[PDB]
Symmetry: D2
């Protein structure tokens, strides 16, 4: 028995708010979950096409994973990273030998507890390996929230600052942490189109975004730039780059003697219909960061995978870094089971298939809806650009530079979400003009149809314009 | 089943060698130490060796290893969840905050609201962000030898040289590599350790007003940089990794000084929290209340990853007025929250804080006797299940390792008294030692038995005999 | 009956032994002694005369050793002496009155001046005031900007070869930036105005007509938050960085900063005081900044002086507070006497109009040279400040690939502008550039036509040699 | 003939204020100067026992210096540092061979225009030579105002920020430049004593301030620390260290492999009754910075002098640093003449002997004035600790951590100055409770008598309470 009224009371009173003021806050109790559904205390079932934070890849409450965690609990317990366990050794083995067995770059893994911790770790390693301070990120990148990971996060609305309630006159950024000179922000891969939608390139055929990034590094001195960090599809920032961007980044970094870190926290583990996002582009990074789909959120886990050469350098020294819960044996038991089910049940192929299906459904919805400017993606990770049906331009001018000071009733993705909710579906986005769609890798055709139907409905209401 | 070997530990050790990044050891020197299972205060190796753990891992398995009520409660949560992020409400998350504020701290007026995260470093990151936003000021004051975590923001307030995630050599003190760029934009002042400013006797020095000199110098730094730009002073009441106990007056004088200067006080309870010192929280020994505390470790007794920040009513009311653009995927994870609830309920139900207090008294008497028989014991101090023992050369009464708490792990461990002690004690099946070269850091579960305390103190006696025999040099 | 006896060989020996080197290693260094100067000429101790078409550092605007300025300095020395900024003198108040009332009397923005000793000091001052006025930390500069060498001014300098680091001798292997230089720097590097051009030379614009350089600048400010950006700092023509912007860039920057609520600092240390054929470089663009910085032509290097001029609204804000800033030599009365005399001579003899007229002359001279020499890819400028783009005559592309991102680790014998300089020297003319593919030409504002002909002649000769390829 | 009423109008209207609001500002015109006097337009003569900013060492408007400047002006003109001149070369030879000919450490000079520029240069050189980022300064040190020099200035009231008019309700530090992570502030040399005023030494005899400084360097890693920067007597900060502090800093820096930069901008060129302040302590630095007394403020000049080994390192590279007016030949002529007159007329011994006279005058004043807690100094650089006689403690509690937001009618050194001005004497200090006394090195005994007489008068008034 649960007194859910008392839960709501304690939630309001004793928990710090995020994204909502206390004044506007309404708690949203979830009593249990299963597959692609959340279940409220009263039995209301919600089809979650956010997959929480694109991070419950295997599906909610997988029985094999939960069984594996219970088995681990018969033995552990807790030991820290200095001690060896079967679960932690095996989890690293599955990643390097089984998932990445066909690639030569993978060297060694360090496990930590969250994606931000994985990014912090990758930044530290890249800087130690190169003995260089600067890291290049991109406009709209999101790489986590802790002090080091936030420095390479250039998504204005997600930098742990304060904004007002339906007022944009109240921006407060964290003092002493609102900019960092050890990071250079390169432009979005998406910023160099001409008025016809064609890509701008230099005389050598290099995308202008890449060429600009190259010039920034030359100007600061390649001898002081450790790495470029990317997302192959910007997650929170909600954008897909030109196909040639990632290959050209790989090339450019090799030529300049600079490491490439690809952040796979969100794109990893089948999200994009391949094992990793980078594998769509025929190149291999120096370092990747992992979270989310690593355990499909069953328990907190993050990881960094470094190349053979980076691993060999680190092996030669005593590294003075300790994180209490890094390698936690029960979280590692969850990771092993998560990955074993993903492999065994061919979840990556499932995602590719469901993605091809989703593309079809979006082709149909676009023909039917003028507020869809474009859509793109793969697997269970899609963007849909929303535009004013009349003007063919976005409703919110600041777009990906907006802040949460805005009134949600003026935000197209907030409007869409609220309408789709009437149909028992959670679907929308985090950017004002852009849908961010994702479900479990094994989402059913039936649930995809249900989601797309609710979206059809929300888009009718949006294009009616009676919300304005 | 006909299966008689679930795990191939030989295979595990090869994977561990090959595929896992090393910490504190080079690959060349590394020797894996596999642990197949744990229970109470014991670690069990796959060959059956049982080790009595008087490190309690990292002073963090407060309830004891593999508590059956906690593990049962985790299994029950797995019937319902699943995963939801912080935007959604659950019974476990809400109850965990309620237990902390209403139940454990029900006799105190300052507590306002909790944010749950996944680790102690994430809790410190959160506390720094909130202190800076609340005051609208950039600077944070820390102390020499403080350890507050390893992530970029938490590391800025960590001033323990050997724990800042840099690289050192294999038995060579001449190859330090710090992380390039790690202080680009750090807004932190290092104030002195409470413990510096000592007599020849050992008195901690005060001015004419009776203000400790460590506190007076901290006041002067904040004045100099301008109190209007200092968001907070962050402390540990007993430095954990740094291995130090302050003079009794230090923490009360810090509270008074911060109030007078209009500066926040963050006390980091990640290690001292949840009965570790024989009160619920370390700050409670000192008759003062902080503005913010950070938590981890004993918050869940490491059963699953959890960290938390608790801010005052004042601070919570301020944050409540704004939309806070901060998201952490696993913050408030419902299964981790289930573990925190059960951990705290057991801790309350069974009076673990009183158990720790009593065992600490019993440890004090054991340590008094060891001191009477070993001149290598300079002094000792502590409470509950958290103890320091200063080790000295019995002949000179000066520490063996001159750099002391400013050492690095580039040193050869065969020269480090706490490594010597530890290696010897292991012959008795006991893990006991410390992280600083001249200072033991001793801790066990809050419910450790008298028999295990005796066993660990016996092992220590034996190790000290060996250290004092000088044969190791 | 008294000789000013100087042992010049001893001078050279002391110079080698006792003075720190810049730009040259000790081993490759050869001292070049200058005994006196006059107009546009440097005189060596043996009497050799060198026509200086660098005007040293584009900074001796009035001409070398102007008799009127030097007499006015001698006159001030009858009274001073030294007093610091807390005390008032005629020379210091008059210098400020001349700038505000007599030179910029046709504009309404000017409020108050603070005098300092150098252009880097003036830039340090401008950064401090902009940040204090807006109560905001970030300043936006551009790729290849040069704003000075001191700690604050260097943060907004993004010219790689001029950031007081170390490079090797004819090796790009060993090189060192100053450790710890960026700990705390609150600076964003925006694109240079020239960054987005097509193969015809047209600078690219978005739909409504905004230059892409400006558009990305605005996007960076939006992303970091306009509420924390104090200012954008510019040069209207990049000095050391050797570049001219498209006409619309500066008006667009003025427009964008007004729209975003951000200050515009224009750095006039090099382009100021007649250098571009108008009193100040920004005056070619029909806009007015919030703050400018001054040096060089401010005193025509007669004595060290720099200055910052701030708008009326900024001045009114500063006036309401006690500002805790002291510089020992700020306002030095004898330096202020030099500034007053330099500016009075400049106004009374119409040096600005002379500069405009001579620029039109130089323009005509460079057209002829470009017709005769294919290694001239393009040229641009005004008054006595010219860039000439030097290219391979056959490809019409630059020889040195790193271009404005080069370092002084390069061998000078591979640098086109070094080659041109070396050749022109045979003719007793100093002319060339600081960037590898780009001439940077300047003389005194009152330079004579005959001297212009003589410099252009030397360049004719140099370019012949460049275009034979023998080097 | 000058219209001083109009000068005063232009000064009010067109010049930026420092230390005063426009509201409270009263211009103080000075028409000419000579020796130790400033002469107002109406002929009023003021005896200047601040020597402006402790910087007109030779005396005001020395005729031999002024004649040398006029001669230079018959030749120059301007040439930058790439060209050699007799004045610039000779200035360098005068410093290294003539003034410092008895010492082995001096290598090479770089001339710049100001003391802050000199400090900026030294910071850059120390960091380049060691290839390390951190520089240790001390609480209350003043090393200049420009961006790099300000990072090592830890004198609160002199960091170019804003304060209010007789109030605390406004106050603003320069955003983005109010603290720096590349500097560590070590304690002031008089850190703590015991109640009796005994110095605290450890078992190795090391003063607590030095031992603490040592621990900071160990903590941050000696391999990361380029230099310790000092003033042998804090100039603006107004303090004299224990005799043994400086020797022990020299020893500690040598042991740790760290450079020692001593800032001689104020203590340099006879100010302390020796050629340089450091020379009272029997040790030699690695780098010194110079200004003020370098030209006795006749024209703007500063300089850095680096050791032979630092000079040999720098000589091996191409240094990409330019400062337009560095080495200005007319400023260099002034420097030459200044140093020649000092040498030829034994200004250093004049300073030493006058300091001994000042000492006996202050001794007599202290017998008669219980508001004098203590005094110390040498040459023409003195501090006097002012206290409330009836409490034996300073009147202004924040002391050297005060700000200029305070009312000057509550500041003892302001009271003293205002009163002393009735006798045509300028004397006082810049810290609230501490006089800072200096005149030209060739100041006459008659002028010392006249200044000390006016101080005696000022202290009668202070002690009377009538100001309160
Ligand atoms: C590419 C990437 N890297 C690192 C992290 C940081 O991982 P964490 O949270 O510390 O475990 C994240 C998390 N993003 C958040 C939760 C998100 C995702 C989508 C929309 C809005 C927000 C990420 O996407
Ligand atoms: C006061 C304090 N705060 C924060 C953290 C950071 O917590 P985390 O690891 O991110 O969950 C810790 C952890 N310390 C480490 C693991 C330690 C303890 C003793 C000896 C050596 C190392 C801590 O002691
Ligand atoms: C736009 C600008 N701002 C500030 C300063 C800094 O003034 P300063 O030197 O401190 O008096 C300068 C100086 N430039 C140097 C001397 C230069 C010029 C041309 C080529 C190479 C270098 C400048 O051009
Ligand atoms: C030790 C020292 N170093 C560097 C400088 C910086 O020299 P500058 O001004 O850039 O030529 C100074 C200047 N001090 C100021 C002007 C002062 C002195 C006494 C009281 C109050 C203020 C200094 O004392």
């Amino acid at each position: 028995k649960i007194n859910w009224e008392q839960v709501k009371e304690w939630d309001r009173k004793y928990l710090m708010r995020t994204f909502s003021t206390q004044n506007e806050y309404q708690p949203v109790p979830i009593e249990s979950t299963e597959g692609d559904y959340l279940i409220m205390p009263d039995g209301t079932r919600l089809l979650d096409f956010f997959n929480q934070l694109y991070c419950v890849n295997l599906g909610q409450k997988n029985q094999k994973v939960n069984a594996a965690i219970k088995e681990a609990l018969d033995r552990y317990g807790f030991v820290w990273d200095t001690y060896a366990t079967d679960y932690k050794a095996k989890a690293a083995k599955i990643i390097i030998e089984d998932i990445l067995g066909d690639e030569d770059w993978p060297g060694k893994v360090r496990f930590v507890s969250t994606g931000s911790e994985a990014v912090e770790t990758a930044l530290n390693i890249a800087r130690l390996y190169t003995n260089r301070p600067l890291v290049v990120t991109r406009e709209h990148d999101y790489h986590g929230w802790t002090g080091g990971a936030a420095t390479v996060t250039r998504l204005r609305s997600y930098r742990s600052g304060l904004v007002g309630e339906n007022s944009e006159s109240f921006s407060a950024q964290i003092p002493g942490s609102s900019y960092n000179s050890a990071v250079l922000m390169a432009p979005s891969p998406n910023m160099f189109q001409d008025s016809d939608g064609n890509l701008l390139k230099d005389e050598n055929g290099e995308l202008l975004s890449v060429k600009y990034t190259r010039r920034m590094i030359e100007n600061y001195g390649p001898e002081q730039v450790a790495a470029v960090i990317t997302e192959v599809s910007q997650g929170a920032g909600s954008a897909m780059p030109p196909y040639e961007y990632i290959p050209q980044i790989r090339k450019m970094t090799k030529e300049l003697g600079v490491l490439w870190i690809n952040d796979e926290v969100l794109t990893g583990f089948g999200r994009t219909g391949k094992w990793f996002g980078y594998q769509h582009y025929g190149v291999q990074p120096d370092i990747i960061t992992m979270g989310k789909g690593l355990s499909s959120s069953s328990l907190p886990a993050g990881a960094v995978l470094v190349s053979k050469e980076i691993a060999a350098f680190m092996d030669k020294h005593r590294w003075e870094s300790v994180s209490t819960y890094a390698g936690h044996p029960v979280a590692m038991a969850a990771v092993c089971a998560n990955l074993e089910v993903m492999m065994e049940e061919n979840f990556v192929e499932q995602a590719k298939d469901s993605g091809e299906y989703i593309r079809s459904k979006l082709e149909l919805l676009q023909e039917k809806h003028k507020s869809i400017g474009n859509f793109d993606g793969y697997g269970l990770l899609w963007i849909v650009d929303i535009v004013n049906a009349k003007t063919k331009t976005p409703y919110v001018k600041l777009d990906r530079n907006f802040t949460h000071g805005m009134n949600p009733n003026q935000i197209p993705t907030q409007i869409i979400m609220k309408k789709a909710l009437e149909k028992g579906v959670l679907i929308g986005g985090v950017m004002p003009n852009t849908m961010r769609i994702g479900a479990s890798l094994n989402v059913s055709r039936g649930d995809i149809d249900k989601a797309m139907d609710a979206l059809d409905y929300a888009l009718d209401y949006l294009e009616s314009g009676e919300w304005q």
